[PDB]
Design a protein around this ligand. Structure first.
Ligand SMILES: [Zn+2]
Length: 352
């Protein structure tokens, strides 16, 4: 309870305040980094307000971490002091599963999340709303020189997720017609990756005063209003797949109507509070599918970030200081951001 400082929630109220704690010494396989930036994710919002009821306190959120290695263990092969490194959703895993062994490490039942979790021996994991971070080399990402740290930080989670989903479900080929539902953090990262894979992108939305970022800033080929039951119906059976990034309850059936029969896939990556109805009749009669995806494993996250570098993909961010974080959270509940918050941890997190 000393050698590291950050901000933490104590309550399901999710209100965050200064908090001091200790990180482990750097083991033979560990990298320590000074945290320079930490993205804010809807997962952090859910965790601090204990949306799903598992979370215990004090809770230091943050899992979109970028920084500079300050210390490497002797057994470390990938990294040296000074490297630009990242840490995403995970800091640990089983190490011996079927999942852990074929780089699907986001599915060992003993996965150790970067924030709001604990190791086997009971010690709680504190995320990147803090001045420094320690992680096994195995969960550390190299940030390419040609991407800025602040705008790469959110790729560690939003980017890994959309890329892993597009790869896994076979929606990463030129010409394919991809729909993206929601135009928040994930939504805009999804559009950038889809355009870089060569797919025609239609954004599906509820905010018509966002068409303009969708078409012009983000470069999407088409724009649809969720409820515009007349334009939607003109877009029926058109799309090879849809990535749904909305973390709010919303109707699934109209999205299914946009999908190609005996082909189209609705891939869900936003996790809401309540669950919608399963459109059994549409799935059966159109021979359509719904699959879910979460963040990809560490190799796939490295591959994602190298792909983003090759294609100059960056998240569209708003830099904020640490003591704005509570306001930032309130703004996330509203979608009021373009598109992702990033905390400037180095310049604005200070010791109490
Ligand atoms: Zn996230």
């Amino acid at each position: 309870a000393e050698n590291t400082f950050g901000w933490a929630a104590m309550d399901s109220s999710g209100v965050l305040s200064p908090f001091t704690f200790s990180r482990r010494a750097t083991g033979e396989e560990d990298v320590r980094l000074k945290v320079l930036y930490c993205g804010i994710c809807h997962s952090d919002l859910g965790c601090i307000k204990n949306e799903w009821g598992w979370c215990s306190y004090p809770l230091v959120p943050g899992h979109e971490i970028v920084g500079i290695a300050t210390e490497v263990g002797s057994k470390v092969t990938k990294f040296k002091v000074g490297d630009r490194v990242g840490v995403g959703c995970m800091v640990g895993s089983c190490g011996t599963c079927q999942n852990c062994t074929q780089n699907q490490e986001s599915y060992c039942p003993e996965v150790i999340m970067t924030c709001a979790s604990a190791y086997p021996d009971g010690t709680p994991t504190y995320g990147g709303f803090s001045n420094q971070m320690v992680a096994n080399e195995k969960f550390v990402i190299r940030i390419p020189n040609s991407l800025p740290l602040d705008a790469a930080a959110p790729l560690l989670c939003a980017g890994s997720t959309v890329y892993s989903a597009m790869k896994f479900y076979g929606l990463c080929s030129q010409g394919l017609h991809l729909g993206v539902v929601g135009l928040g953090g994930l939504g805009h990262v999804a559009v950038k990756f889809a355009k870089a894979f060569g797919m025609k992108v239609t954004v599906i939305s509820t905010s018509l005063g966002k068409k303009e970022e969708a078409i012009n800033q983000l470069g999407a080929d088409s724009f649809l209003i969720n409820t515009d039951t007349e334009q939607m119906q003109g877009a029926m059976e058109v799309m090879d797949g849809i990535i749904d990034t909305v973390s709010a309850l919303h109707p699934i059936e109209p999205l299914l109507g946009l999908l190609k029969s005996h082909q189209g896939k609705l891939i869900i990556v936003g996790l809401p509070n309540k669950q919608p109805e399963l459109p059994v009749f549409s799935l059966i009669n159109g021979r359509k599918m719904i699959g879910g995806s979460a963040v990809g494993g560490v190799k796939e996250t490295q591959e994602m970030i190298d792909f983003a570098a090759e294609h100059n993909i960056t998240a569209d961010i708003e830099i904020v200081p640490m003591d704005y974080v509570n306001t930032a959270m309130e703004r996330l509940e509203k979608g009021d951001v373009k598109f992702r918050f990033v905390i400037d941890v180095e310049n604005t997190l200070v010791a109490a």
